[PDB]
Amino acid sequence: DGPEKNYEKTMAILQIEAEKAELRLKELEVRRLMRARGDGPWYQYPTIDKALIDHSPKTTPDN
Amino acid sequence: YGPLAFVLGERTTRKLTETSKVITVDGNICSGKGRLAREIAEKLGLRHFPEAGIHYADSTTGDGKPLDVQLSGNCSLEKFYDDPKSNDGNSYRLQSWLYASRLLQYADALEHLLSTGQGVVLERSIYSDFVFLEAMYRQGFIRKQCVEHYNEVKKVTACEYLPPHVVVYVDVPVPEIQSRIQKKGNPHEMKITAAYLQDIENAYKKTFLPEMSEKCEVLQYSAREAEDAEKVVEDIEYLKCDKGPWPDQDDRTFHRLRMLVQNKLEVLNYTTIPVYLPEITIGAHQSDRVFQKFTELPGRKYSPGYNEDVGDKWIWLK
Amino acid sequence: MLKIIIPTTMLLPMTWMSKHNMIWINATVHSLLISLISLSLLNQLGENSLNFSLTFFSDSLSAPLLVLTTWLLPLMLMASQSHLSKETTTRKKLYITMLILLQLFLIMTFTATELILFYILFEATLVPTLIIITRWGNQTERLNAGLYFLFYTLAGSLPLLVALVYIQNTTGSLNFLIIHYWSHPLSNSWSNIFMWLACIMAFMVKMPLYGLHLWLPKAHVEAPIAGSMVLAAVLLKLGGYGMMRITTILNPLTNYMAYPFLMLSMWGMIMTSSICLRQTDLKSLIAYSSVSHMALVIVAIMIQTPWSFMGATALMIAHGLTSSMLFCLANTNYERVHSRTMILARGLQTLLPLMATWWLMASLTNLALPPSINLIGELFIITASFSWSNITIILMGMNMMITALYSLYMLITTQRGKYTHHINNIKASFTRENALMALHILPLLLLTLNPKMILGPLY
Amino acid sequence: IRLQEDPDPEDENLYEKNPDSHGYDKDPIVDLWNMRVVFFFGFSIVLVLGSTFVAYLPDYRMQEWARREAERLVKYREANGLPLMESNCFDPNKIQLP
Amino acid sequence: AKTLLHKYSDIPEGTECHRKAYASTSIGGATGLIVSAYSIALKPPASFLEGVARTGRYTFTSAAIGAIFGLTSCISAQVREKPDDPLNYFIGGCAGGLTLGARTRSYGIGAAACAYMGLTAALVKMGQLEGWQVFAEPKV
Amino acid sequence: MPLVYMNIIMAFAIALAGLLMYRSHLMSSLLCLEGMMLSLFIMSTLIILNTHFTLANMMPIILLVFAACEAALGLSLLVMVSNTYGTDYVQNLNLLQC
Amino acid sequence: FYIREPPHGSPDWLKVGLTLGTSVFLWIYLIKQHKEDVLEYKRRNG
């Protein structure tokens, strides 16, 4: 084929691979920050559910 | 049959009846035990298994026709009769192959008994096969290491099987046996010496018969006595059933035994124990060549039913 | 690139579903057709590489090697027809499939765009090779040879895997194009030094560096003919290709870290050529000659000049062809006398005349006779090293002299003198062996008319 | 030590059964056809046609294009007085040197 | 554990060679005691005196290796005036390997131990200088 | 923590050390197992009672149940060893090596 | 041919029919699921 076909295919491939590399670095930074802070949807280790607490009159008045 | 059948309710103790017994008719070479065994089978109604030879396994597997010696057995009884001290190890190889054949025969017999319920009348047994080996060792045909290998193989296979309820032994003396052999016609049998038969009789009367009498009853008959089938049958019909460990068997051990005897490769698992005796150790090149020859036999390439050469069809949907 | 990969895969069902009288014929036909098709890959652009897709690409470095592999597969089949004639049909099919898998893996190594895919396939090439060496070898040393080879390669390559994953994590990508454009200088810290080593030692083991070369003689001697053919023609050039590909991200630390390897190779060439001067096994002599020849490629890659890279590519192609042909000739001699002792059979110039001419031409190519591509590569590397340092010329000239000496010594010992009296099984050479030698030689001589094809991407 | 087959005699010369052998297999017909296949697809196709294909391969290395561009550039430089080849691969006006 | 590690590392390179050697000796002695305990547990000595002798031999070997390594490294740092060069630790490790060979009375063991130990000590020094983490905290 | 907690933890530690250090009999090892179970029962019971974790007062009973289940397991294994070797000596368990 | 009839023997038409029916049912369910997924994906986006 023409020399321009390989040129444009190479440009598309380079764009895709550069986007992949940037996304990989972004993902690594995001994962590190989420693990360090725990303020995102990832690394949300479970805690005690507050629906188990019994909010009813107990025996002793001081609860 | 499997664990599912045992769970669902199929129990062998239901099938066992008065005549659900395994009978082994023993005797020295050409003692006429075969006719006695056949007559016992005819009158008691039990199934008769002719003594296992070199090509017994060929009868049960495939067309029922013997294969070539190179493929099935790699041993010759005639060669042993001609040259019992051969350097090819034909003597001990034949003895081990015969022990394996009788082990398979005993498994088939027990299977038949535990499935159909009909009794079995075998000629000799794995329990009686050691007599020939001991005679060979005493004559000097085989060395001590062969006997050790035979004992090692036997102690791992025979323990998983129940000894026969009745042991019928014919006691034709050595000179009469020699006369019969010299009148039988077979020159190879005529080549048999006297000390060989004498040692066979010695082993039979010193180890087999006493040990079998320790377990169960052991009926004994001479040449004249064994010729009355009715007399022998009547003795079996009135033997004390307490003899033998079979009354000590429940459906659990029966299930174990029936599972074992249905898997022939499991039966023969310890026959090929990796003991590198020069008498039985087949080399890699010969093993490959003989296995390739066996695989090229009609019907022996694929599993039974998938060999298109022998008329098996529907393989695409089978 | 799938135009070559798909037929290579389809070779397997073809051989498996072919009659027992037609495995070799069909394999040869379609391997030759695959090579003919792969010849189209030589139309490389001047500057940009041929980027077929996201996964596969080819430049003026990958294409010659791909053509060499696709051309060498039929040659391996023809050479291995002889001894694998009494084998069963299933094992013959298995051997053919091992060869096909090796060729497929080599193609996908030479075309891979991702360094980690390249690593995966270039380590996947071990399994078919090892099996071939340890299953169809003739001697009892084939078991130790397979272990040495496998463990040398793995101990070299595992740190390469670690380094590649680290680079992927740090730079974000392992694609060759991106890693070439987004290239950055390496500092002189110890961490960069050890990353450089991890990236380099893996390929230094493959193309045997002097000291790490002990596996090559065992592997080439104990393996069957076809196995030795691949090991000498392509499996050694794998390391050179990998080094030429990865040296992009290893600068400028190479300038200072290449000295140990440069000295090791420039002395090991002389040492291994001298070893060839005093060898008693033909295959061992050829293997040590291969070590000596690959030392020059190691030097050329470690110098990183355009002439050095051109010479490295030319020498890789030329040496692959020459070593494969030499191993084939030694295989013919072995199949005739059933022994690899060089001094056993003598005076073969009087019993096999055409085989003597094949030996002569192969030895002339081995000793870099002008205008063969062997000499083109050697002279380019010599000029590059002389520009690097004038002192290098002494070692280069000594190596050339010893190479000529041992090549002509092999020619004299084997194809000259008085015939061995007791040997009577030397039959006239078959058409197959002569055709194998002709197919080894004719492309080699024709490449001298168009050397630009195998001069690499820096031409 | 073992019951093993004796070492097979050294490979029987294929010339014995058929003096015309070409090596390869044992059947004469398959020998002839294997030799024909090898010679044809090796020399007449992938060697001859291969070398012709690689000899007339279109100039995608742009060697003639580079030579023509060099000729045009040399004409321009010498005719207009320019000093042939400059001393900077890039224009200094676009370099923000520290 | 980390107490001894910081008793050895806090001492600056090429300073207080006696105290550095003492800290290295203590670390070696602790390692030798651990090895002796494991050897006694897995390979029981016949007698209590035999166990004491085995423990003493192992502890003395390990402590001597540590002391020689520390002394050699500190002396090299002092004389060469290069505290941050891994060659000092390489020399110390090779000296420790030579002492190990001397205790085992084997030249081959001595040479192999010198080589491997020197390489490992140089690697440890490089990791300290660069910041290599043998046990990396989970960071992702 | 109160000193009773220290004493109970020390008792558990002593029982663990005893179990880990066999002398001859397998019976004494089972004794050390039962002692550890008893110590854990006492610890858990004190913790539950002190913190008035009413719904968790059934935990020590379950612990005791599985404790004597393990004790029965040990006793059955002990009888099998004695039947197979004549003594419950821990040295008879030697066939399986490495 | 064989003295003992093969354990497989004539095809177990019950088992063969069950296998064929299961395979056909799996293919039909897969095709229907793919069609439903394509339709739902188009619906949720446009």
Next chain:
Amino acid sequence: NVLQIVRDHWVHILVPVGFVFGCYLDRRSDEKLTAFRNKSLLFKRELRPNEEVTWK
């Protein structure tokens, strides 16, 4: 018989069909890389009449 020939040498068609399929797959892969078809400053030119794509 002709049917004998095909039933004995049907394998001589796999690898050619394989090459055809590989060429088709390469074309399909090239289809999914038309992100810069005519948008490169070097080969960007106006499409000639009756030419929807430059196939690049």
Next chain:
Amino acid sequence: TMMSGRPGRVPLQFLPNEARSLPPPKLTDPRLVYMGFLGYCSGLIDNAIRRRPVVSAGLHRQLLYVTSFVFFGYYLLKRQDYMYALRDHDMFAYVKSHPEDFPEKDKKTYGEILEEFHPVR
């Protein structure tokens, strides 16, 4: 454990309802074809082990192998695509909601940046 603790994640659910907003994997997917190839290889090995004609015996069994492998592979690929889409969505949302941690860098062209030249002599 990353995605295990995501809010709203229903336990023991192979495909959440939100996954339907993603395009289903095509039935001509190369991964699905490879799953079918694995099923066919499993059938061939099953034939080989039971000592029956490898390429012809039991066409129904090989067909069942291929169908089951393709079915499970399709569902597995759908779940994998959903999980990767979830990862990308969460990463993008976290980047958007934390501008300080991911600031735009000054874009200096190579004409401005000074990268040291290391000669090769």
Next chain:
Amino acid sequence: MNPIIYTTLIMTVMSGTMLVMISSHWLLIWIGFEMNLLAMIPVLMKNFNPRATEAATKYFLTQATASMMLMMAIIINLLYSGQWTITKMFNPVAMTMMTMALAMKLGLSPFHFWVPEVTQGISLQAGLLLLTWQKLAPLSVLCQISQSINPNLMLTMAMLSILIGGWGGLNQTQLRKIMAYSSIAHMGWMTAVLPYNTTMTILNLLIYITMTLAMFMLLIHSSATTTLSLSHTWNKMPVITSLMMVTLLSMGGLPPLSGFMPKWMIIQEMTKNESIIMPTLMAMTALLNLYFYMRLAYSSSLTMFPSTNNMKMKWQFEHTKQMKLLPTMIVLSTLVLPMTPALSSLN
């Protein structure tokens, strides 16, 4: 043993593991462990031999000690936190005790000593269960508490496990002991990535389970327990020994086989956390495992050993027992590398 009783015991083992993997209460996890041990001992002793009794006794002693330590850790965590939920353990001493107990249950070195002995004592049927199913519950517990695990202790245990597994596998000629040491090495590989990424631990566990299922089922199909006995299998059934060679190569971690997936992903995750020395050492030490696998491959298929004459009779008969999962387990353990991006489904 009655088949109904054996099925009940197997279901009790499985129910104990499911209780461990399903509950949210520490007491129920300990209960599941106890049920697993109770129903595992008779399964170990299904075939009554002195070696089987010895294996059962050793396994019972080790698991009992581990369960006692685990319950002590649970009690201490309750004392210092008043919590029973499986969450971030609030006491370092309790965390250390629980880690030791769980490593002893898994067989991580230096708690590895019982694995080669118990594995050799029991049959292949019981060995498969011991080396595959008995690893699920402790690994699940470790994955639930990976946040509180001290990384240093777990990494030291993993590295020691890999080293000791490789070293032990080299001197072994019994196949069961080789499998046990390989299991120890693979458990070390799995536990190396626990503090970093548990999904990689799950992936490694799945791959190892498939490989070990394939290997044990091939051994059962060959009825071989020693290298010499397995060598004879080339004559009767070359397919089995060829598949065994392929599976051994996969277990070695050689690409493109499936065994490369877990090591590759583990090295990736450990390099993402700036740990470069530990994964390199682990990869280098895997070469010992690769060595003994290769030695077995030589003795089994790559090279042919002398058979015996009696194999001629065995040639005539065909295997009756049919393991329906063996081809699938072989395929999944050899040819699944092109399918790594399926890792996300384990998230």
